[PDB]
């Protein structure tokens, strides 16, 4: 009930003892997975360092399915300290 | 002159004036679908007409100023048009 109430349904038997074994640590993983998704699919260097200008990274997602991300440039911090990253993902231009 | 046993580049023209999805029909015909069944819905011959007129042309890296020599370079700017009754099928022409 506790987990199903915090999340909204899909709670397996693995979650339960994981949580019991690691109260705070499990919760934190949930916080991150909510935010960033499945990180375990990133290549290690990209996991620790991200990317550099003009670099292209393949992320294997499923047999025949993958994200191709090129990082074009990173803008200056605007008046609120946000930087605009210029991306190209799967033949489509994106901004973050 | 000849027969072309397949789709051609210029097939879009016909689709617009007859209102039939040639390409979709190809998939349905291969699947075993009867023309006059419920998937293809081919009008009977004398009920197939033309609704106005349709024109196609092609944009090629051919330079008309050098006996149509297909220039090899990079696209750094691409502005497609769009419009009601306008149809764009994008090949080698995009942002990057």
Annotated catalytic residue B79: no
Strands (E), chain B: 62-63, 69-70
Contacts of A78 (CB under 8 A, 6+ apart): A84
Nearest CA in chain A to B93: A91
Closest-CA distance, A28 to chain B, in angstroms, reads 39
**What residues 67-96 of chain B have any CB closer than 8 A to a CB of chain A?**
94-96
Q: Which chain B residues touch A93 with a CB distance below 8 Å?
A: 95-96
Closest-CA distance, A43 to chain B, in angstroms, reads 25
Helices (runs of H) and strands (runs of E) counted in chain A? 4, 4
Q: Which of A55, A26, A29, A51 is nearest to A40 (CA)?
A: A29
Q: Which of A55, A65, A60 is nearest to A86 (CA)?
A: A55
Query: Rounded CA gap, A61 and A39, in Å?
Result: 11
Closest-CA distance, B88 to chain A, in angstroms, reads 17
Structure determination technique employed: X-ray
CA distances, B33 to each of B6, B30, B43, B46 (Å): 18, 7, 14, 21
Q: Which chain A residues touch B96 with a CB distance below 8 Å?
A: 88, 91, 93
Query: Rounded CA gap, B42 and B26, in Å?
Result: 12
Q: Which of A91, A90, A71, A85 is nearest to B78 (CA)?
A: A91
Answer yes or no: are the C-beta atoms of B21 and B12 closer than 8 Å.
no
């Amino acid at each position: 009930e506790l987990l199903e109430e915090e999340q909204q349904g899909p709670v397996t038997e693995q979650d339960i003892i994981s949580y019991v074994l690691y109260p705070k640590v499990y919760e934190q993983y949930i916080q991150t997975r909510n935010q960033y998704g499945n990180l375990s699919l990133l290549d290690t260097p990209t996991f620790f360092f991200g990317m550099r200008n003009g670099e292209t990274v393949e992320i294997e997602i499923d047999k025949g399915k993958r994200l191709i991300i090129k990082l074009e440039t990173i803008s200056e911090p605007d008046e609120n300290g946000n930087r605009t990253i210029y991306y190209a993902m799967n033949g489509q231009a994106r901004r973050i | 002159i000849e027969v072309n046993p397949r789709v051609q580049v210029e097939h879009t023209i016909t689709e617009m004036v007859t209102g039939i999805d040639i390409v979709k029909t190809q998939i349905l015909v291969a699947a075993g679908a009867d023309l006059f069944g419920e998937e293809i819905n081919m009008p009977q011959q004398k009920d197939i007409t033309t609704l106005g007129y349709a024109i196609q042309c092609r944009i090629t890296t051919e330079d008309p100023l050098n006996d149509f020599m297909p220039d090899t370079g990079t696209i750094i700017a691409y502005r497609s048009s769009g419009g009601f009754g306008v149809r764009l099928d994008a090949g080698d022409g995009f942002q990057g």
